[PDB]
């Protein structure tokens, strides 16, 4: 099956969590959320005795999570973050819920 893993430790992860900084007006860019998630977690499938990486839908998943919280993102990626929200990151042959906190 597809599973998610920690990039740095290699451990299998079921639920993830990251922190992303806002600017002094409480604005965040989706690109910084995508970087926080994808730098920390990756998806892969075992085959041919190795882990094979699988592309995650992180940007789309972030925008979908914010739209479920009634938060819009503008054409160049900025939005007003909630304090914390959950992104359901998907990779295809698995879903990794990732808690995103914006202090």
Alpha-carbon gap, residue 44 to 59, rounded angstroms: 18
The answer to whether 102 and 21 have CB atoms below 8 angstroms apart is yes
Alpha-carbon gap, residue 23 to 43, rounded angstroms: 30
The pair of structure tokens assigned to 10 is 């290699």
Report DSSP state, residue 83.
S
Rounded to 5 degrees, φ, ψ at 72 are -90, 155
Of 79, 89, 74, 82, the residue nearest 41 (C-alpha):
89
């Amino acid at each position: 099956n597809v599973n998610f893993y920690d990039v740095t430790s290699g451990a299998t992860v079921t639920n993830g969590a990251v922190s992303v900084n806002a600017d002094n007006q409480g604005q965040v860019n989706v690109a910084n959320v995508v970087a926080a998630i994808n730098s920390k977690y990756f998806a892969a499938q075992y085959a041919d005795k190795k882990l094979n990486t699988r592309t995650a839908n992180t940007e789309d998943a972030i925008k979908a999570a914010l739209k479920d919280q009634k938060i819009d993102v503008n054409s160049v990626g900025y939005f007003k973050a909630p304090h914390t929200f959950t992104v359901n990151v998907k990779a295809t042959s698995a879903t990794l819920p990732v808690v995103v906190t914006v202090p």
